[PDB]
Design a protein around this motif. Structure first.
Motif, PDB file in Angstrom:
ATOM      1  N   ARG A   1      63.936 126.576  -7.950  1.00  0.00           N
ATOM      2  CA  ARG A   1      63.783 125.379  -7.141  1.00  0.00           C
ATOM      3  C   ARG A   1      64.777 125.380  -5.983  1.00  0.00           C
TER       4      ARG A   1
ATOM      5  N   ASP B   1      53.579 119.092  -0.012  1.00  0.00           N
ATOM      6  CA  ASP B   1      52.889 118.182  -0.907  1.00  0.00           C
ATOM      7  C   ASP B   1      53.473 118.289  -2.315  1.00  0.00           C
ATOM      8  N   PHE B   2      53.855 119.495  -2.720  1.00  0.00           N
ATOM      9  CA  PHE B   2      54.440 119.655  -4.041  1.00  0.00           C
ATOM     10  C   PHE B   2      55.799 118.964  -4.112  1.00  0.00           C
TER      11      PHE B   2
ATOM     12  N   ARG C   1      56.305 115.702 -10.158  1.00  0.00           N
ATOM     13  CA  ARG C   1      56.646 116.685 -11.181  1.00  0.00           C
ATOM     14  C   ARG C   1      57.353 117.940 -10.657  1.00  0.00           C
ATOM     15  N   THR C   2      58.372 117.749  -9.824  1.00  0.00           N
ATOM     16  CA  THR C   2      59.120 118.883  -9.292  1.00  0.00           C
ATOM     17  C   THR C   2      60.406 119.110 -10.083  1.00  0.00           C
TER      18      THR C   2
ATOM     19  N   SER D   1      55.766 115.423  -4.653  1.00  0.00           N
ATOM     20  CA  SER D   1      55.117 114.943  -5.884  1.00  0.00           C
ATOM     21  C   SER D   1      56.092 114.528  -6.991  1.00  0.00           C
TER      22      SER D   1
ATOM     23  N   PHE E   1      48.978 121.602  -9.634  1.00  0.00           N
ATOM     24  CA  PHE E   1      49.949 120.518  -9.735  1.00  0.00           C
ATOM     25  C   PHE E   1      49.362 119.192  -9.276  1.00  0.00           C
ATOM     26  N   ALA E   2      49.916 118.107  -9.811  1.00  0.00           N
ATOM     27  CA  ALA E   2      49.494 116.747  -9.501  1.00  0.00           C
ATOM     28  C   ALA E   2      50.558 115.829 -10.105  1.00  0.00           C
ATOM     29  N   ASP E   3      50.366 114.517 -10.018  1.00  0.00           N
ATOM     30  CA  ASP E   3      51.366 113.605 -10.562  1.00  0.00           C
ATOM     31  C   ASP E   3      51.183 113.285 -12.031  1.00  0.00           C
TER      32      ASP E   3
ATOM     33  N   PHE F   1      64.412 128.081 -13.791  1.00  0.00           N
ATOM     34  CA  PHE F   1      63.962 126.880 -13.096  1.00  0.00           C
ATOM     35  C   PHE F   1      64.873 126.429 -11.950  1.00  0.00           C
TER      36      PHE F   1
ATOM     37  N   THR G   1      51.123 122.833   1.530  1.00  0.00           N
ATOM     38  CA  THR G   1      51.042 122.704   0.080  1.00  0.00           C
ATOM     39  C   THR G   1      52.435 122.506  -0.516  1.00  0.00           C
ATOM     40  N   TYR G   2      53.401 123.273  -0.022  1.00  0.00           N
ATOM     41  CA  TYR G   2      54.778 123.178  -0.497  1.00  0.00           C
ATOM     42  C   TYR G   2      55.356 121.779  -0.233  1.00  0.00           C
TER      43      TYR G   2
ATOM     44  N   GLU H   1      51.462 122.080 -16.734  1.00  0.00           N
ATOM     45  CA  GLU H   1      51.166 123.058 -15.688  1.00  0.00           C
ATOM     46  C   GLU H   1      50.826 124.464 -16.182  1.00  0.00           C
TER      47      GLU H   1
ATOM     48  N   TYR I   1      55.735 126.851  -5.994  1.00  0.00           N
ATOM     49  CA  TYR I   1      55.080 125.709  -6.638  1.00  0.00           C
ATOM     50  C   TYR I   1      53.963 126.242  -7.546  1.00  0.00           C
TER      51      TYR I   1
END
Ligand SMILES: Nc1ncnc2c1ncn2[C@@H]1O[C@H](COP(=O)(O)OP(=O)(O)OP(=O)(O)O)[C@@H](O)[C@H]1O
Ligand SMILES: [Mg+2]
Ligand SMILES: [Mg+2]
Lengths: 350, 19
Positions: A133, B5-6, B11-12, B9, A239-241, A129, B2-3, A203, A235
């Motif tokens: 990232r 937007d992610f 939940r990163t 967000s 995905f969403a909140d 992870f 998209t990246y 997810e 990503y």
């Protein structure tokens, strides 16, 4: 040509025998699990390597050896409250019985009045992870290197009638050789057939899990699809909140790929992120071979991966034993132990 | 993108399991 056919045909007879001996070994341990193989005082608690919605994993040094380990601590009372009793028993019973190059090894386990402890080999490279990232995304060959290891691991796990259920970068660690060490068997379950528990990570949930439908090992293959996608794109495909928003996207049956994804990658992913589990790769007549023989994996030497003979695309920095620089820092908390035994009957077999 | 937007967000960060 006829040479690859012979190579592929032969290797399969080999993995067949391998899996056979593997099941015997597993079954022996599965039927008679090790128990109470150490105690809390034999270790010095150094620092928290990570926490989950269930427990805390701390780096520890074994006093009479100096060796370092990753100790997962679970509050018995919390386990009961979160209705994770059977899952926790599954977790330890399964983890202590498995044996594979890419599965974290459980060194010891025990319990006291308040907690359950699982002492694992410490994987110092950090979670996939954090690296993912930080870097943004992995190149297809980089993602493939890790994917190949997950494919072999699931082949192993599935052959023992085990379903993993929580594949994600957070539960994957990089060892000193740059290889993967799967951890967190919290949702692992030995089951022949369908099961129904709502569990996993948003997810990565397959549609069946979201729709409260029974499901089988095919959910692990779907999760692999999500993993590869996230590793290669940077990503998740969905995905969403809020989880519910993610779920509607997952069950919709619509997935968009980045412009830089190769044709082979997109094809593999369309087959893994197949809502119809009867058409999903890994769950067809030829099972896992449909994946191993897929074009995207054309350059993958499966036997070589298993032997860890392939040069890893990335090797984490390691400044010596006890180095936790590859892990985020967490707030610490004293490991409280009641003078009163808690939930004794519930965890008798642990 | 998209990246973007992610990355923007909620939940990163590390994702915990649900049950
Ligand atoms: N053997 C290990 N070596 C190093 N770090 C480890 C090891 N095992 C676990 N960790 C770290 O500790 C974290 C927490 O462990 P784990 O995932 O098992 O907790 P969890 O409560 O089950 O999390 P989840 O919310 O996914 O269920 C991992 O994400 C990882 O960063
Ligand atoms: Mg976890
Ligand atoms: Mg877990």
């Amino acid at each position: 040509g006829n040479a690859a056919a012979a190579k592929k045909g032969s290797e399969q007879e080999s993995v067949k025998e391998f899996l056979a001996k593997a099941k015997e070994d597993f079954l022996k341990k599965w039927e008679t699990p090790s128990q109470n193989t150490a105690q809390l005082d034999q270790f010095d608690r150094i620092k928290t390597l990570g926490t989950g919605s269930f427990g805390r994993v701390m780096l520890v040094k074994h006093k009479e050896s100096g060796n370092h380990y990753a100790m997962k601590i679970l509050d018995k009372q919390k386990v009961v409250k979160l209705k994770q009793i059977e899952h926790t028993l599954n977790e330890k019973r399964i983890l202590q019985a498995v044996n594979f190059p890419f599965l974290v090894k459980l060194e010891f386990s025990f319990k006291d009045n308040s907690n359950l402890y699982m002492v694992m080999e410490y994987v110092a490279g950090g979670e996939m992870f954090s690296h993912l990232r930080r870097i943004g995304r992995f190149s297809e060959p980089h993602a493939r290197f890790y994917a190949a290891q997950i494919v072999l691991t699931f082949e192993y796990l599935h052959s023992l009638d085990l379903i993993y259920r929580d594949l994600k970068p957070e539960n994957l660690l990089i060892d000193q050789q740059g290889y993967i060490q799967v951890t967190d068997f919290g949702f692992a379950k030995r089951v022949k057939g369908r099961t129904w528990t709502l569990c996993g990570t948003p997810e990565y949930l397959a549609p069946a899990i979201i729709l409260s439908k029974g499901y089988n090992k095919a959910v692990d293959w779907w999760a692999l699809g999500v993993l590869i996608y996230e590793m290669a794109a940077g990503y998740p495909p969905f995905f969403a909140d809020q989880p519910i928003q993610i779920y509607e996207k997952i069950v919709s049956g619509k997935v968009r790929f980045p412009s830089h994804f190769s044709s082979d990658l997109k094809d593999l992913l369309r087959n893994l992120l197949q809502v119809d589990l009867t058409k999903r790769f890994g769950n067809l007549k030829n099972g896992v071979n449909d994946i191993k023989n897929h074009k995207w994996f054309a350059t993958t030497d499966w036997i070589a991966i298993y032997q860890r003979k392939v040069e890893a695309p990335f090797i984490p920095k390691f400044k010596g034993p006890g180095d936790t620089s590859n892990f985020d820092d967490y707030e610490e908390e004293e490991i409280r132990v009641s003078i009163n035994e808690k939930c004794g009957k519930e965890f008798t077999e642990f | 993108t998209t990246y973007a937007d992610f990355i923007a967000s909620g939940r990163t960060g590390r994702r915990n399991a649900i049950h």
